Design an enzyme around this catalytic site. Structure first.
Site, PDB file in Angstrom:
ATOM      1  CB  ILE C  67      -6.957  -3.197   1.371  1.00 14.60           C
ATOM      2  CG1 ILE C  67      -7.338  -1.852   1.994  1.00 14.60           C
ATOM      3  CG2 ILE C  67      -5.927  -3.912   2.232  1.00 14.60           C
ATOM      4  CD1 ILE C  67      -8.495  -1.165   1.304  1.00 14.60           C
ATOM      5  CG  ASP C  68      -2.484  -3.183   2.811  1.00 13.23           C
ATOM      6  OD1 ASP C  68      -2.693  -4.331   2.500  1.00 13.23           O
ATOM      7  OD2 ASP C  68      -2.379  -2.816   3.958  1.00 13.23           O
ATOM      8  N   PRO C  69      -0.435  -3.604  -0.291  1.00 13.07           N
ATOM      9  CG  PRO C  69       1.680  -2.612  -0.609  1.00 13.07           C
ATOM     10  CD  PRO C  69       0.220  -2.267  -0.486  1.00 13.07           C
ATOM     11  CB  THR C 130      -2.080  -3.727   7.324  1.00 12.16           C
ATOM     12  OG1 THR C 130      -3.084  -3.787   6.302  1.00 12.16           O
ATOM     13  CG2 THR C 130      -2.752  -3.713   8.688  1.00 12.16           C
TER      14      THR C 130
END
Ligand SMILES: Nc1ccn([C@@H]2O[C@H](COP(=O)(O)OP(=O)(O)OP(=O)(O)O)[C@@H](O)[C@@H]2O)c(=O)n1
Ligand SMILES: [Mg+2]
Lengths: 418, 1004, 218
Positions: C67-69, C130
């Site tokens: 979804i994200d780093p 996040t």
DNA sequence: ATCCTCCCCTAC
DNA sequence: AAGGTAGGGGAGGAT
């Protein structure tokens, strides 16, 4: 992402590969699996093919007719018989090649077929040949079993198998008429041998070699004669007195041959078969030659019976009796006859135990009015006489009174037999 | 503590609580917090065999569990349906559990909360204060609802607060973007519990120069420096953009009862949220009543997929994630799901909703004065228009001319409005509030104070129009009625469809009748047939056609036949006509008609010739009672409709009774839906078979009936069409009509429910007298049970084109020759939304001309077809070269979705390429406009090869270039086939096509 | 290896030819939001945003999408941890180790497995947070994922609550699997058998299966 | 020609 | 979370 979903995909994967020989009861399951596969993943790499035919040719090679030369190798030889070819897959029914359908085979044969396929699961499907209402097992198509262990098991369970030969060949072995004759006489089999197939140890692919000649013959008549229990086969007789072997009725029906014509025949060393280079005529002329009181029972001929209480008792495997009321007590003595008496309705039992066809008999009954009182048939007639033009339907219609007499009798015994 | 329930909502933290929002008689708002449980139904054997002890449980009584799977047999040895009776328990678990044998698992936990505690979602309870514990200011916790909501008192009214909002954002040459384009105006309609309405608009001062701002204040505007100087009682306030957004969040965080917008979930609230975050580090924070949660506004998406397999999505809606007990209601999705329009835009909705007929009171040079009152239109139309005239800026005349309002004067009963309109050669005109006549993109290039004030007037109108639509559609009445009908929170009334809303009353029925429905086998669906459709006997009748329609056919079929999954005795099939007769003779004795009904269906399998279903009617099943509940509700709202005198009361109550018609019809539909808990193949197809038989019965007795001198002779014998009955059958019935009446009745059409009965008279007054007489005799002497029909109308000048396509003039049953008939179009291009506005105008003109020539009667030779065909070609060629008709008359609208096989469908391609390039995004449930546009440098084309290559989507700024024209070939071809199919000449019609188009025509 | 000029940091993007026919929109989209995005501290640094674009798409079969780093210590490479000290990669390596038997290793990097392209749906996040830049990358994330989808046969997403509506964002059907993210409670990532399911689906689609053990480095 | 399939939308 | 069949008219294609 569950183990249940992985299992369902593996079931689709196995059945997607196992096509073209398992079409008896598989397409509905296949359609369910692919509809699941697409519903839960939004995409599936299948085309939902539903018109799969039966074809096992990918396991074999072309027929070799020329005198070729293959010298080295360890080979197993099988005397391939003349007859119609069937396969039997894992947990499936008996299916004929070329046109996918279902067939009824003896329960003792089907049970033995399951026993060898349950004993070891390295066999994709079995191979059978049918000639003159005799079933013989020939060559099992497998991945993990050589063509040896299936013969040992099949014999013990009770299936007919050919005698097979094994040899390691190093010397020059040119295929020709001479070798063919030596090989075929070395198996000690009695059934007509049409060709010899061999497999090389280490290779699953089959190859078959067929040495034959042609003969020019003239047919004078076609007769029908008994082989079994109300089961007859055609025999094509030429002006010379020689016979041309026919395996079933379909061969003569499709070949469109007539009496007093010239045909091509495939000549073998011990027998010959009609070589293959409008339906009503060929069916009626063969019947007329042997007598009007014959019909075509799908694959075989069958004569019109003279059905009565004596015939009913013989087919139900019970003692002979004279009064219909005696049937109730002669059926409850054993536990093995009930299997075919209580488990099906009167209509089905009277059709099978009297010698009527399936497709043609339903056609007749679906064009017929009945007068029924107290579940007893007392009168009937025909609404549309155009259904009677088929020689098979006219033959059974003209003797329908025999069905009615037995039909009422079978109802009577059930009333008190339960 | 008398309170009225306003809303229910659930928290979503580590612990789950259910909150009630209710208001006391004095206006005080009280929140009550309930523990949230998971509900399981198990047998006694299971209840006592659970290793982890249950938290709580109560007996449900002694319930009968019925296996309602379906099997077919080839004989009559049918065994009893597998049934058991056992003590049942309802188990409450704070945490989710998995029980090996738990039944009734298709029901919602919120449904168990309501039903097993005797709580009505919209009740007005007098709560017992010894169970409520005070946990915060105005907030209680209730650990025992069963002894708290025991007493309910008569309903009473309470005040409610509302917020209506709208914004306007800077527009350059693209859709406003939160990263570039500032907000210019924000408007509110603020309504408090006292009823005082505050109307104000905020203006962004940072778009005006110092001189423009100085004049704004001196001309009567407030200039506030920060949030703490805001005054909600001033019409216009100027402030910086940051202040605009800080005011916006100060209002949105308030505990309103409703916060109502139009398409504001995707744009209005989304822009405010994102634009604030970019400018300042501020959040819009919602809090639960007990202050155990705090969440930030973040609009999320809910998708709606289709019920098939490889199918894609076919709608989408956006929702607010608030947890503060406020309903953020969005009119956009509400109207789209409950309205039929070419497109669902704010201007199109108002154009149809707020209209009346007005008379020209005084003509002038650059003005035209209109007057509207109860003497020019139906009662209440002038009042609805007058209310919207208060804020409205433009009024549209005859749906074509958009006039700017110069003066307005609201009268005690009607209104007077002075518009800027050219002289028109008539006295009576249609007024509606439709599209405006401004170009905002240009107004943001020369932006100044006078423009800023002009925009402020439009913004407050858009904020108030949401209120007028809110009342117009009766949203509050629909919400409360739905929450009571299906037992669910008020906030969820409009989210769910049949598969869910039926489960409320279904659970009550199962618990009252003590029934458990279970299955053990695999469900397999087969096709089955539908209703009986007759073919039209003629095309043009010129006679009065009486319509006799069954009041509620399928619901009454399911009651009459007692058609329910647990009531089926069995299905008997045969493969041959010898055993079929044996089975028929035995069925007539084992299942006597006085207790059983025998339904002779069509076989499901191709190898069967007969399939008979036996239903036992002695014990009424579950579906008949479910249907009775919905049928009773519809009757109650129909009764109230009869007493509605205003223009909004009639529309609201008509909508209510229509809804219940669909829900009861959905109860049938869920029986043939493979994934329904109520699925029953045999029962669904048996309902249809009985329906067909009733239509054939009624058609037969009427077709050939003769009204004579004091009696009616029915065509057939009036016997029971299903079984042997003790009713009279004599086809001769005494009438109360004059002996001078000598008529004959025929039957010309009929589809599933109604029969079209033709009489050989043209008078519309005698037709009503006779039809009412038939209505009495048919219900009392022809029909034999709970089936009834109603006389609805006399159709005059009926013309049918196909089985399901006809037009007529409608004289209702409750009318006479002195009334104005309605214009009825059913199934034809006049009502289809995928044809044109150009097609509609010409088909109406030529269809009327054809009817008049045939009604008058001349038949000189072939003149009827010749005159029509020659005139049609003239008009088609005239438009082709003149090209004066604007593009808006040739636009079609179509719904976007992803429900395509082989995803490269031209429709997905066209929209996808549109979305990637045009700033306007088409959503998965949105209707977009498109047209067929071709190069302007090509001749009239007679041979058409590719049509899909001319389609383009029309946005808000779509202007044709000098090298483009309308692809007239496709518009004219479709119109010509529709007109010429009406003709009855076999030589002139075919030659016409060959000259004009050169294509092969199709006729019906 | 070509490049384009960007108006704001990193002021340039270097990309592989396979990404060329989406670069036009990426430049326009990024130049709309970079002036806002770059005001704060990001994970990773801006010079690591477009680092997976230097990657051929013609030899990829399966995409592993996050979804994200990582909120911190990002390298621009999805799931990558220079010391194998991040929970997400620990559970990814652990699950496949159970299936394959490979337990003696120093790290596990999805970018060296034949046919695997790991991807972060959002290209960056706010440092320590996040899902914090969902508004900034909305246009770009949709474009980039669709471009990959046109190349791979099996899209493997991590997180049932985050990708539940991923079908709404793609116009080209792909054999989608959605599992659990390797960070949630109750160790639900290691209870799935998605590694074998993917290979079975690939075989059904007539594609070469992935030897997931190639990702282990010792 | 020439029918088949798919689709969009309406009457029930 | 997700109601059912009957039917017309139109575009494109595989013959
Ligand atoms: N969505 C709908 C619609 C119809 N129908 C079916 O069409 C039948 C006739 O339609 P109808 O006459 O318009 O409806 P009705 O039940 O007779 O109600 P009435 O207006 O009081 O007479 C209905 O009985 C069935 O309900 C179906 O299935 N679903
Ligand atoms: Mg009706």
């Amino acid at each position: 992402t569950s183990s249940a979903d992985l299992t369902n995909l593996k079931e689709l994967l196995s059945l997607y590969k196992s096509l073209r020989f398992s079409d008896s009861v598989a397409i509905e399951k296949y359609n369910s699996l692919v509809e699941w596969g697409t519903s839960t993943y939004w995409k599936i790499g299948v085309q939902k093919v539903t018109n799969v035919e039966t074809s096992i040719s990918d396991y074999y090679d072309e027929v070799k007719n020329k005198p070729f030369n293959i010298d080295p190798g360890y080979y197993i030889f099988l005397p391939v018989y003349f007859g119609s070819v069937f396969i039997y897959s894992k947990g499936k029914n008996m299916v004929e090649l070329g046109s996918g359908n279902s067939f009824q085979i003896p329960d003792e044969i089907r049970s033995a077929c399951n026993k060898v396929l349950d004993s070891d699961n390295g066999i994709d499907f079995l191979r059978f040949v049918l000639l003159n209402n005799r079933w013989i097992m020939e060559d099992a198509i497998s991945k993990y079993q050589s063509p040896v262990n299936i013969f040992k098991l099949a014999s013990e369970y009770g299936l007919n198998i050919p005698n097979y030969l094994e040899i390691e060949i190093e010397e020059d072995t040119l295929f020709d008429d001479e070798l063919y004759s030596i090989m075929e006489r070395s198996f000690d089999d009695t059934f007509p041998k049409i060709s010899i197939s061999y497999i090389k140890l280490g290779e699953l692919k089959r190859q078959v070699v067929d040495f034959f000649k042609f003969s020019f013959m003239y047919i004078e008549s076609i007769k029908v004669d008994r082989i079994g229990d109300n089961i007859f086969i055609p025999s094509v007789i030429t002006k010379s007195g020689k016979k041309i072997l026919v395996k079933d009725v379909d061969h003569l029906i499709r070949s469109k041959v007539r009496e007093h014509t010239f045909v091509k025949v495939k000549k073998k060393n011990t027998f010959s078969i009609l070589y293959d280079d409008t339906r009503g005529e060929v069916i009626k002329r063969i019947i007329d030659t042997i007598g009007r009181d014959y019909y075509v029972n799908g694959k075989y001929f069958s004569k019109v019976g003279i059905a009565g209480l004596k015939q009913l008792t013989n087919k139900l495997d019970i003692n002979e009796c004279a009064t219909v009321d005696e049937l109730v007590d002669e059926i409850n003595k054993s536990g093995t006859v009930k299997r075919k008496i209580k488990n099906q309705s009167v209509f089905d039992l009277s059709r099978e135990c009297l010698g009527y066809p399936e497709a043609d008999f339903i056609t007749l009954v679906n064009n017929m009015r009945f007068k029924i009182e107290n579940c007893k048939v007392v009168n009937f007639n025909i609404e549309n006489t155009n259904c009677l033009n088929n020689p098979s339907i006219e033959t059974i219609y003209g003797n329908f009174n025999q069905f009615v007499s037995i039909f009422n009798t079978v109802t009577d015994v059930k009333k008190r037999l339960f | 503590m008398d309170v009225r329930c306003i809303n229910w909502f659930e928290s979503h933290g580590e612990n789950r609580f259910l909150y009630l929002k209710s208001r006391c008689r004095n206006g005080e708002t009280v929140f009550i917090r309930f523990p949230h449980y998971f509900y399981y139904v198990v047998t006694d054997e299971i209840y006592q065999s659970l290793s982890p002890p249950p938290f709580n449980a109560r007996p449900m009584g002694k319930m009968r569990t019925i296996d309602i799977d379906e099997t077919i047999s080839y004989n009559l040895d049918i065994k009893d349906r597998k049934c058991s009776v056992a003590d049942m328990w309802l188990i409450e678990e704070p945490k989710k559990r998995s029980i090996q044998n738990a039944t009734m698992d298709e029901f919602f936990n919120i449904s168990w909360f309501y039903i097993s505690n005797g709580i009505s979602p919209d009740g007005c309870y007098s709560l017992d204060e010894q169970y409520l514990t005070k946990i915060n200011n105005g907030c209680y916790h209730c650990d025992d609802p069963r002894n708290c909501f025991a007493k309910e008192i008569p309903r009473f009214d309470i005040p409610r607060s509302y917020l209506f909002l709208a914004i306007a954002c800077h527009f350059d040459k693209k859709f406003p973007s939160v990263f570039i384009n500032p907000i210019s105006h924000t408007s509110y309609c603020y309504i408090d519990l006292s009823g005082k309405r505050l109307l104000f608009t905020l203006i962004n001062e940072e778009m005006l120069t110092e001189q423009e701002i100085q004049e704004a204040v001196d001309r009567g505007c407030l200039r506030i420096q920060s949030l703490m100087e805001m005054d909600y009682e001033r019409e216009l306030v100027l402030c910086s953009e940051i202040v605009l957004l800080r005011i916006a969040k100060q209002l949105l965080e308030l505990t309103f009862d409703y916060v109502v917008t139009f398409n504001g979930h995707n744009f209005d609230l989304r822009y405010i949220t994102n634009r604030l975050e970019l400018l300042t580090g501020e959040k819009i924070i919602f809090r639960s009543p007990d202050k155990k949660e705090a969440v930030h506004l973040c609009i999320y998406e809910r998708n709606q997929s289709s019920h098939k397999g490889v199918c894609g999505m076919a709608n989408t809606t956006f929702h607010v994630n608030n947890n503060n007990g406020t309903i953020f209601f969005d009119l956009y999705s509400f109207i789209q799901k409950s309205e039929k329009l070419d497109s669902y835009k704010l201007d199109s909705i108002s154009k149809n909703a707020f209209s009346c007929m007005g008379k020209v009171l005084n003509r002038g040079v650059r003005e035209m004065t209109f007057i509207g009152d109860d003497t020019t239109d139906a009662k209440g139309k002038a009042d609805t228009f007058a209310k919207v005239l208060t804020t409205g800026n433009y009024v549209t005349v005859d749906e074509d001319i958009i006039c700017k309002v110069i003066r307005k004067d609201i009268l005690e009963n009607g209104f007077k409005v002075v518009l800027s309109c050219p002289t028109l050669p008539n006295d009576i005109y249609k007024l509606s509030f439709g599209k405006d006549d401004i170009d905002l993109a240009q107004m943001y290039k020369d932006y100044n104070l006078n423009i800023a004030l002009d925009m402020a007037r439009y913004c407050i109108h858009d904020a108030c129009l949401c209120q007028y639509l809110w009342e117009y559609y009766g949203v509050e009445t629909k919400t409360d009625a739905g929450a009571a009908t299906y037992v669910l929170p008020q906030s969820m009334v409009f989210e769910y469809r049949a598969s869910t809303i039926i489960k409320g009353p279904l659970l009550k029925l199962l618990l009252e009748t003590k029934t458990i429905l279970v299955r053990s086998e695999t469900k397999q669906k087969f096709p089955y047939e539908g209703g009986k459709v007759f073919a039209p006997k003629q095309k043009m009748f010129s006679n009065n056609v009486l319509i006799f329609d069954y009041n509620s056919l399928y619901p009454n079929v399911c009651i009459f036949g007692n058609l329910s999954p647990e009531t089926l005795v069995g299905v008997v099939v045969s493969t041959n006509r010898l055993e079929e007769e044996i089975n028929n003779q035995l069925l007539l004795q084992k299942y006597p008609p006085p207790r059983y009904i025998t339904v002779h269906c069509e076989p499901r399998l191709p190898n069967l010739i007969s399939e008979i279903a036996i239903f036992d009617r002695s014990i009424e099943g579950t579906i008949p009672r479910l249907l009775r509940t919905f049928l009773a509700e519809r009757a109650r709202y129909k009764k109230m409709l009869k007493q509605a005198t205003s223009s909004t009361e009639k529309a609201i109550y008509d909508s209510m009774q229509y809804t219940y018609k669909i829900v009861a019809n959905s109860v049938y539909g869920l029986m043939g839906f493979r994934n329904s808990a109520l699925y029953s193949y045999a029962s669904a197809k048996s309902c249809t078979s009985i329906g067909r038989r009733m239509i054939l019965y009624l058609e037969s007795v009427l077709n050939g009936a003769e009204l004579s001198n004091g009696m009616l002779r029915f065509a057939n014998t009036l016997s029971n069409p299903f079984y042997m009955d003790d009713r009279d059958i004599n086809p001769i019935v005494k009438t109360s009509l004059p002996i001078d009446y000598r008529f004959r009745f025929r039957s010309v059409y009929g589809d599933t429910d109604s029969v079209f009965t033709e009489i050989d008279s043209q008078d519309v007054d005698k037709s009503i007298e006779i039809a009412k007489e038939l209505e009495r005799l048919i219900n009392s002497r022809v029909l034999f049970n709970n089936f009834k029909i109603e006389f609805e109308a006399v159709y005059k000048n009926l013309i049918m084109q196909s089985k399901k396509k006809y037009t007529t003039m409608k004289y209702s049953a409750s009318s006479n020759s002195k009334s104005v008939p309605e214009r009825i179009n059913k199934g034809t291009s006049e009502t289809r939304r995928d044809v044109s506005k150009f097609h509609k105008n010409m088909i109406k003109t030529y269809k009327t001309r054809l009817s008049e020539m045939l009604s008058e009667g001349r038949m000189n030779s072939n003149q009827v077809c010749i005159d029509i065909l020659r005139s049609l070609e003239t008009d088609l060629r005239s438009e082709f070269d003149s090209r004066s008709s604007p593009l808006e008359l040739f636009m079609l609208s179509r719904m976007h979705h992803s429900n395509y096989k082989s995803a490269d469908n031209p429709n997905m391609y066209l929209v996808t390429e549109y979305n990637k390039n045009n700033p306007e995004t088409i959503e998965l449930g949105e209707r977009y406009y498109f047209a067929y546009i071709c190069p302007a440098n090509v001749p009239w084309t007679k041979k058409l090869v590719n049509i899909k290559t001319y389609e383009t989507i029309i946005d808000r700024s779509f202007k044709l270039g000098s090298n483009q024209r309308i692809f007239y070939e496709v518009y004219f071809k479709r119109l010509t086939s529709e007109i010429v199919n009406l003709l009855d000449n076999k030589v002139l019609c075919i030659s016409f096509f060959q000259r004009m188009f050169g294509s092969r025509p199709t006729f019906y | 290896m070509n490049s384009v000029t960007i108006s704001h940091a990193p002021y340039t993007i270097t990309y592989h030819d396979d990404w060329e026919p989406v670069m036009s929109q990426l430049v326009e989209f990024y130049n709309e939001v970079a002036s806002w995005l770059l005001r704060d501290e990001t994970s990773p640094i801006p010079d690591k945003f477009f680092i997976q674009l230097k990657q051929p798409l013609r030899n990829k079969r399966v995409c592993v999408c996050g979804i994200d780093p990582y909120p911190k210590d990002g390298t621009g490479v999805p799931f990558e941890s220079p010391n194998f000290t991040k929970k997400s990669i620990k559970e990814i390596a652990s699950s496949i180790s159970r299936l394959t038997g490979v337990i003696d290793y120093k790290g596990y990097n999805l970018n060296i497995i034949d046919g695997v392209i790991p991807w972060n749906y959002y290209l960056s996040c706010k440092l320590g947070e996040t899902k914090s830049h969902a508004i900034y990358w909305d246009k770009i994330s949709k474009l980039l994922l669709q471009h990959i989808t046109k190349h791979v046969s099996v899209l493997y997403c991590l997180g049932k609550t985050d990708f539940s509506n991923i079908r709404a964002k793609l116009e080209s059907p792909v054999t989608t699997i959605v599992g659990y993210h390797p960070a949630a409670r109750d160790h639900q990532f290691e209870k799935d058998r998605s590694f074998e399911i993917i290979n079975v689906l690939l075989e059904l689609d007539n594609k070469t299966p992935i030897n997931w053990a190639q990702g282990f480095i010792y």
